[PDB]
Structures are given as C-alpha cells and as structure tokens.
Nucleic acid binder design. Structure first.
Length: 47
RNA sequence: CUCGGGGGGGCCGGGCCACCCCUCCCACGGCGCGACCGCUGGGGCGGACUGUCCAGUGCGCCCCGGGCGGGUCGCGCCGUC
C-alpha cells in the first residue's frame, strides 16, 4: 500500500566529543621530558 | 673677394635645443610613514591531557605587546646627459 520511506528528521545537537583527540607533538614531547625527570629524580631520592 | 672668367656672404617667417625659473603624468631605484594582508611573548575565560615533587603541555574564544620579514595599496621626499 505504501512502501515509501520518510527519513527521520535530523535535529541539531550540542557539540559533544565522546573520545579523546590525538596528543600534539608538544604534549607527546613534554610527556617524555616529565618521564625522564621523574626517573632521575627517583634515582637521586633513593641514594 | 680674385684676374666679362672665377670664389664667398646672404635674403624671412615657424618651431626646437642650449641659458634662467617654475610645472603635469609615467617608469625605475632609494628613504620615511600609514592601512590591510601577514612571519612569530604576556593576560583572561573554557576545556583536555601529562608527570613515581604540587608542577607541566596542547587546543577554542577574547585582549594586548614585542622582534622584525615580505606582499598589495596610498602617501611625502630624494636621484635620472
């Protein structure tokens, strides 16, 4: 009788992000520096 | 002027360049300023993340400032057998 499909009407939404974006080069680079400082700092503390 | 023959100056108008002053546009080069593009420390808000010391790193919007680079445009001055 009626096989036509009425598409679901789209509704605008508030911008929401549900997953992390990529870390930048600076963030990745600074992370290694913090890890290096943390390692040496722990070594000095132990001695 | 020289022995009819021979040698010269010419005839009067216009514009132009030299001389002395200003003056329009264009081209090229330089200097300075300005506008916009435009390369690139500080502050505020929001948010995401990192570090085996509380510290640190991007991102979104806004407000400034410096170093000083180029381009487009517009001026002002200088130079050009």
């Amino acid at each position: 009788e009626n096989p036509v499909y009425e598409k679901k009407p789209k509704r605008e939404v508030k911008k929401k992000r549900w997953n992390r974006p990529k870390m930048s080069l600076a963030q990745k680079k600074d992370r290694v520096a913090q890890k290096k400082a943390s390692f040496l700092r722990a070594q000095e503390r132990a001695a």
